Amino acid sequence: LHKEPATLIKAIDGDTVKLMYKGQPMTFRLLLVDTPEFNEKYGPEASAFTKKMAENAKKIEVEFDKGQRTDKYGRGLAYAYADGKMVNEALVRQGLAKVAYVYKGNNTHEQLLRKAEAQAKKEKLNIWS
Ligand SMILES: Cc1cn([C@H]2C[C@H](OP(=O)(O)O)[C@@H](COP(=O)(O)O)O2)c(=O)[nH]c1=O
Ligand SMILES: [Ca+2]
């Protein structure tokens, strides 16, 4: 897999963000994770976490997996990075997302994220508290 450039257009919530990619606006949904909706417990914390990570970043990149690159809603499916740090992983490590939506053929970083979820659970962080 490889990283490609994008720029932030707007934070949306914990697991979706509006980025410009190959010069076009797109909503990206983060692969392999599920944040609470804003209206749910830890939703506002998840939104804030992703917003801060994306806005503070000097460099945003997206990394598509081997399979589908857009979902049935026209959302781009990617791993997102802020200054080299994967947002998907960071959310899970902080207990602000669960590993979820692991479809065959778009699951390259599954075990990395499960290891992060285990550590968040051990620490009883946020959604595991
Ligand atoms: C993360 C992800 C979601 N989806 C679809 C599955 C779910 O369909 P349904 O809407 O019918 O539940 C929805 C969950 O996204 P959200 O968590 O953003 O709601 O997005 C994919 O198709 N591929 C994916 O990789
Ligand atoms: Ca969600």
PDB file of C-alpha atoms and ligand atoms in Angstrom:
ATOM      1  CA  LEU A   1       0.000   0.000   0.000  1.00  0.00           C
ATOM      2  CA  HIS A   2       1.147   3.619  -0.431  1.00  0.00           C
ATOM      3  CA  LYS A   3       0.378   7.027   0.920  1.00  0.00           C
ATOM      4  CA  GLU A   4      -0.999   9.735  -1.360  1.00  0.00           C
ATOM      5  CA  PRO A   5      -1.526  13.436  -0.722  1.00  0.00           C
ATOM      6  CA  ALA A   6      -4.725  15.120   0.346  1.00  0.00           C
ATOM      7  CA  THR A   7      -5.605  18.336   2.140  1.00  0.00           C
ATOM      8  CA  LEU A   8      -8.194  18.940   4.847  1.00  0.00           C
ATOM      9  CA  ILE A   9     -11.388  20.656   3.710  1.00  0.00           C
ATOM     10  CA  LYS A  10     -13.442  20.094   6.905  1.00  0.00           C
ATOM     11  CA  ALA A  11     -13.704  17.865   9.943  1.00  0.00           C
ATOM     12  CA  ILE A  12     -16.992  15.999  10.028  1.00  0.00           C
ATOM     13  CA  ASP A  13     -17.023  13.475  12.897  1.00  0.00           C
ATOM     14  CA  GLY A  14     -14.881  10.762  14.582  1.00  0.00           C
ATOM     15  CA  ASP A  15     -14.588   8.544  11.515  1.00  0.00           C
ATOM     16  CA  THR A  16     -15.450  10.773   8.527  1.00  0.00           C
ATOM     17  CA  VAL A  17     -13.638  13.794   7.156  1.00  0.00           C
ATOM     18  CA  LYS A  18     -13.915  15.942   4.049  1.00  0.00           C
ATOM     19  CA  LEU A  19     -10.599  16.029   2.175  1.00  0.00           C
ATOM     20  CA  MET A  20      -9.464  17.251  -1.187  1.00  0.00           C
ATOM     21  CA  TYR A  21      -7.965  14.294  -3.086  1.00  0.00           C
ATOM     22  CA  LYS A  22      -6.538  14.505  -6.615  1.00  0.00           C
ATOM     23  CA  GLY A  23      -7.979  18.003  -6.598  1.00  0.00           C
ATOM     24  CA  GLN A  24     -11.589  16.931  -5.862  1.00  0.00           C
ATOM     25  CA  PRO A  25     -13.627  17.260  -2.646  1.00  0.00           C
ATOM     26  CA  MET A  26     -14.526  13.835  -1.166  1.00  0.00           C
ATOM     27  CA  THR A  27     -15.902  12.567   2.141  1.00  0.00           C
ATOM     28  CA  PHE A  28     -13.581   9.856   3.480  1.00  0.00           C
ATOM     29  CA  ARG A  29     -14.775   7.157   5.842  1.00  0.00           C
ATOM     30  CA  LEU A  30     -11.844   5.672   7.858  1.00  0.00           C
ATOM     31  CA  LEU A  31     -11.276   1.962   7.181  1.00  0.00           C
ATOM     32  CA  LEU A  32     -11.615  -0.695   9.926  1.00  0.00           C
ATOM     33  CA  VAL A  33     -13.049   1.542  12.649  1.00  0.00           C
ATOM     34  CA  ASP A  34     -16.338   2.703  14.119  1.00  0.00           C
ATOM     35  CA  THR A  35     -16.556   5.835  16.221  1.00  0.00           C
ATOM     36  CA  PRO A  36     -19.780   6.620  18.169  1.00  0.00           C
ATOM     37  CA  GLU A  37     -22.088   9.051  16.348  1.00  0.00           C
ATOM     38  CA  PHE A  38     -21.978  12.609  17.712  1.00  0.00           C
ATOM     39  CA  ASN A  39     -25.271  11.973  19.486  1.00  0.00           C
ATOM     40  CA  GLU A  40     -23.812   8.917  21.241  1.00  0.00           C
ATOM     41  CA  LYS A  41     -21.566   8.534  24.299  1.00  0.00           C
ATOM     42  CA  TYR A  42     -17.964   9.438  23.359  1.00  0.00           C
ATOM     43  CA  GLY A  43     -19.215  10.756  20.034  1.00  0.00           C
ATOM     44  CA  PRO A  44     -18.328  14.314  20.803  1.00  0.00           C
ATOM     45  CA  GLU A  45     -14.911  13.236  22.127  1.00  0.00           C
ATOM     46  CA  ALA A  46     -14.289  11.163  19.016  1.00  0.00           C
ATOM     47  CA  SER A  47     -15.208  14.078  16.707  1.00  0.00           C
ATOM     48  CA  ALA A  48     -12.907  16.436  18.655  1.00  0.00           C
ATOM     49  CA  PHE A  49     -10.026  13.969  18.533  1.00  0.00           C
ATOM     50  CA  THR A  50     -10.201  13.505  14.749  1.00  0.00           C
ATOM     51  CA  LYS A  51     -10.816  17.246  14.214  1.00  0.00           C
ATOM     52  CA  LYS A  52      -7.720  18.183  16.227  1.00  0.00           C
ATOM     53  CA  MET A  53      -5.552  15.531  14.643  1.00  0.00           C
ATOM     54  CA  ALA A  54      -6.586  16.557  11.073  1.00  0.00           C
ATOM     55  CA  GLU A  55      -6.443  20.362  11.649  1.00  0.00           C
ATOM     56  CA  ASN A  56      -3.085  20.354  13.482  1.00  0.00           C
ATOM     57  CA  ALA A  57      -1.401  18.228  10.745  1.00  0.00           C
ATOM     58  CA  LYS A  58       1.113  19.844   8.437  1.00  0.00           C
ATOM     59  CA  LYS A  59       0.622  16.985   6.022  1.00  0.00           C
ATOM     60  CA  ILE A  60      -2.448  14.783   5.495  1.00  0.00           C
ATOM     61  CA  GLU A  61      -2.142  11.586   3.454  1.00  0.00           C
ATOM     62  CA  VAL A  62      -4.571   8.849   2.468  1.00  0.00           C
ATOM     63  CA  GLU A  63      -3.784   5.228   1.827  1.00  0.00           C
ATOM     64  CA  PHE A  64      -6.265   3.041  -0.005  1.00  0.00           C
ATOM     65  CA  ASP A  65      -6.317  -0.670   0.648  1.00  0.00           C
ATOM     66  CA  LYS A  66      -6.377  -3.503  -1.985  1.00  0.00           C
ATOM     67  CA  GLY A  67     -10.158  -3.583  -2.456  1.00  0.00           C
ATOM     68  CA  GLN A  68     -13.023  -1.151  -2.834  1.00  0.00           C
ATOM     69  CA  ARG A  69     -11.973   2.512  -2.650  1.00  0.00           C
ATOM     70  CA  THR A  70     -15.441   3.940  -2.368  1.00  0.00           C
ATOM     71  CA  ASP A  71     -18.416   2.722  -0.400  1.00  0.00           C
ATOM     72  CA  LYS A  72     -22.069   2.561  -1.483  1.00  0.00           C
ATOM     73  CA  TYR A  73     -22.541   6.188  -0.279  1.00  0.00           C
ATOM     74  CA  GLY A  74     -19.664   7.515  -2.461  1.00  0.00           C
ATOM     75  CA  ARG A  75     -17.338   7.880   0.560  1.00  0.00           C
ATOM     76  CA  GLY A  76     -13.675   7.191  -0.036  1.00  0.00           C
ATOM     77  CA  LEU A  77     -12.444   4.254   2.079  1.00  0.00           C
ATOM     78  CA  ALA A  78      -8.896   4.844   3.301  1.00  0.00           C
ATOM     79  CA  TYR A  79      -6.416   4.903   6.123  1.00  0.00           C
ATOM     80  CA  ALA A  80      -5.736   8.558   6.905  1.00  0.00           C
ATOM     81  CA  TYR A  81      -2.403   9.876   8.235  1.00  0.00           C
ATOM     82  CA  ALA A  82      -1.618  13.153   9.987  1.00  0.00           C
ATOM     83  CA  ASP A  83       2.121  13.932   9.861  1.00  0.00           C
ATOM     84  CA  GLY A  84       2.779  10.192   9.410  1.00  0.00           C
ATOM     85  CA  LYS A  85       0.561   9.030  12.328  1.00  0.00           C
ATOM     86  CA  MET A  86      -2.461   6.940  11.308  1.00  0.00           C
ATOM     87  CA  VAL A  87      -5.716   8.522  12.477  1.00  0.00           C
ATOM     88  CA  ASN A  88      -7.557   5.189  12.329  1.00  0.00           C
ATOM     89  CA  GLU A  89      -4.986   3.592  14.699  1.00  0.00           C
ATOM     90  CA  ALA A  90      -4.853   6.590  17.031  1.00  0.00           C
ATOM     91  CA  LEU A  91      -8.657   6.620  17.547  1.00  0.00           C
ATOM     92  CA  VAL A  92      -8.618   2.893  18.439  1.00  0.00           C
ATOM     93  CA  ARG A  93      -5.604   3.275  20.718  1.00  0.00           C
ATOM     94  CA  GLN A  94      -7.415   5.978  22.681  1.00  0.00           C
ATOM     95  CA  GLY A  95     -10.611   3.911  23.053  1.00  0.00           C
ATOM     96  CA  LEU A  96     -12.550   6.391  20.891  1.00  0.00           C
ATOM     97  CA  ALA A  97     -13.268   3.805  18.174  1.00  0.00           C
ATOM     98  CA  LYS A  98     -13.765   0.051  17.973  1.00  0.00           C
ATOM     99  CA  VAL A  99     -12.252  -2.141  15.257  1.00  0.00           C
ATOM    100  CA  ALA A 100     -15.256  -2.738  13.001  1.00  0.00           C
ATOM    101  CA  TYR A 101     -16.301  -3.276   9.356  1.00  0.00           C
ATOM    102  CA  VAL A 102     -13.441  -5.614   8.568  1.00  0.00           C
ATOM    103  CA  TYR A 103     -14.241  -6.737   5.037  1.00  0.00           C
ATOM    104  CA  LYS A 104     -12.142  -9.354   3.194  1.00  0.00           C
ATOM    105  CA  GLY A 105      -9.659  -7.678   0.823  1.00  0.00           C
ATOM    106  CA  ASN A 106      -9.709  -4.254   2.510  1.00  0.00           C
ATOM    107  CA  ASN A 107      -8.110  -5.330   5.773  1.00  0.00           C
ATOM    108  CA  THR A 108      -4.400  -4.787   5.466  1.00  0.00           C
ATOM    109  CA  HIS A 109      -4.027  -2.973   8.797  1.00  0.00           C
ATOM    110  CA  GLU A 110      -6.446  -5.156  10.815  1.00  0.00           C
ATOM    111  CA  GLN A 111      -3.950  -6.714  13.164  1.00  0.00           C
ATOM    112  CA  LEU A 112      -2.194  -3.359  13.840  1.00  0.00           C
ATOM    113  CA  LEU A 113      -5.545  -1.882  14.895  1.00  0.00           C
ATOM    114  CA  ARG A 114      -6.574  -4.919  16.975  1.00  0.00           C
ATOM    115  CA  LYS A 115      -3.308  -4.628  18.915  1.00  0.00           C
ATOM    116  CA  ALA A 116      -4.191  -0.977  19.629  1.00  0.00           C
ATOM    117  CA  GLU A 117      -7.737  -1.937  20.708  1.00  0.00           C
ATOM    118  CA  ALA A 118      -6.302  -4.537  23.115  1.00  0.00           C
ATOM    119  CA  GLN A 119      -4.089  -1.919  24.717  1.00  0.00           C
ATOM    120  CA  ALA A 120      -6.990   0.583  24.997  1.00  0.00           C
ATOM    121  CA  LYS A 121      -9.102  -2.125  26.592  1.00  0.00           C
ATOM    122  CA  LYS A 122      -6.317  -3.028  29.042  1.00  0.00           C
ATOM    123  CA  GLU A 123      -6.129   0.625  30.000  1.00  0.00           C
ATOM    124  CA  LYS A 124      -9.929   0.823  30.357  1.00  0.00           C
ATOM    125  CA  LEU A 125      -9.894   3.971  28.167  1.00  0.00           C
ATOM    126  CA  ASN A 126     -13.014   5.888  27.162  1.00  0.00           C
ATOM    127  CA  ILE A 127     -15.337   3.419  25.402  1.00  0.00           C
ATOM    128  CA  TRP A 128     -13.722   0.629  27.447  1.00  0.00           C
ATOM    129  CA  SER A 129     -14.167   2.451  30.764  1.00  0.00           C
TER     130      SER A 129
HETATM  131  C1  LIG B   1     -16.245   1.383   7.017  1.00  0.00           C
HETATM  132  C2  LIG B   1     -17.160   0.915   5.924  1.00  0.00           C
HETATM  133  C3  LIG B   1     -18.495   1.180   5.935  1.00  0.00           C
HETATM  134  N1  LIG B   1     -19.276   0.701   4.921  1.00  0.00           N
HETATM  135  C4  LIG B   1     -20.739   0.930   4.984  1.00  0.00           C
HETATM  136  C5  LIG B   1     -21.264  -0.252   5.840  1.00  0.00           C
HETATM  137  C6  LIG B   1     -22.483   0.349   6.585  1.00  0.00           C
HETATM  138  O1  LIG B   1     -23.634   0.263   5.717  1.00  0.00           O
HETATM  139  P1  LIG B   1     -25.000   0.730   6.409  1.00  0.00           P
HETATM  140  O2  LIG B   1     -25.140   2.180   6.353  1.00  0.00           O
HETATM  141  O3  LIG B   1     -26.121   0.080   5.555  1.00  0.00           O
HETATM  142  O4  LIG B   1     -25.085   0.390   7.916  1.00  0.00           O
HETATM  143  C7  LIG B   1     -22.034   1.834   6.797  1.00  0.00           C
HETATM  144  C8  LIG B   1     -21.395   2.131   8.179  1.00  0.00           C
HETATM  145  O5  LIG B   1     -20.815   3.419   8.076  1.00  0.00           O
HETATM  146  P2  LIG B   1     -21.055   4.388   9.280  1.00  0.00           P
HETATM  147  O6  LIG B   1     -20.482   3.837  10.492  1.00  0.00           O
HETATM  148  O7  LIG B   1     -20.348   5.696   8.860  1.00  0.00           O
HETATM  149  O8  LIG B   1     -22.560   4.599   9.493  1.00  0.00           O
HETATM  150  O9  LIG B   1     -21.038   2.056   5.800  1.00  0.00           O
HETATM  151  C9  LIG B   1     -18.735  -0.017   3.913  1.00  0.00           C
HETATM  152  O10 LIG B   1     -19.465  -0.413   3.020  1.00  0.00           O
HETATM  153  N2  LIG B   1     -17.420  -0.261   3.836  1.00  0.00           N
HETATM  154  C10 LIG B   1     -16.619   0.148   4.862  1.00  0.00           C
HETATM  155  O11 LIG B   1     -15.454  -0.092   4.848  1.00  0.00           O
HETATM  156 CA    CA B   2     -19.761   5.728  12.998  1.00  0.00          CA
END
